Design a protein around this ligand. Structure first.
Ligand SMILES: [Ca+2]
Ligand SMILES: [Ca+2]
Ligand SMILES: [Ca+2]
Ligand SMILES: [Ca+2]
Lengths: 19, 91, 94
């Protein structure tokens, strides 16, 4: 405990997806 | 020869999506209504509770990549990926 | 609820299976081709066809590796899990 959109947004750019 | 924890994990992701996406409107996608309850009911230990509409606007915005105002399964798996990655670093 | 949800324990299981196999040989936080093979064959024996050719494992690691170091870290592994799961979804409503 605990995360937020803080940390959530923090790992949206370190990787998109090679879907 | 009996289904792994991993394989039952993947299935569970599918089930929780359908448990909530089937509620209102498109039964195959999550509107903001359904997304909020999912997070609040099923991720109450990993993510801070949502009670502000502003929050739900922003989460859906980051999650919605096809621009339809809803979260389909593909977009949801990305979300699971994001949350899971975060949980790993603090473990 | 106050109990760990099915979703949250699913996420934990993804983490656990990764450390279960990445910790075996060499870098305990990454999967070499050796470790990747065992994971798939023992834990994904119902979704993916068994791997017995080295050529197969070579091509898969190349595709999974986006940072280009020749191994699969957890971040790259989540992409893989995401990818596999999506395919299974598509093959349940088609
Ligand atoms: Ca819906
Ligand atoms: Ca969408
Ligand atoms: Ca290793
Ligand atoms: Ca890599």
């Amino acid at each position: 405990a605990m995360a937020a959109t803080y940390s959530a947004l923090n790992s949206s750019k370190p990787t998109p997806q090679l879907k | 020869s009996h289904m792994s924890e991993l394989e039952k994990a993947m299935v569970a992701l599918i089930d929780v999506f359908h448990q909530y996406s089937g509620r209102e409107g498109d039964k195959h996608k999550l509107k903001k209504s359904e997304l909020k309850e999912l997070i609040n009911n099923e991720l109450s230990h990993f993510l801070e509770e949502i009670k502000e509409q502003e929050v739900v606007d922003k989460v859906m915005e980051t999650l919605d990549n096809d621009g339809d105002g809803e979260c389909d399964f593909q977009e949801f798996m990305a979300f699971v990926a994001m949350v899971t990655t975060a949980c790993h670093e603090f473990f």
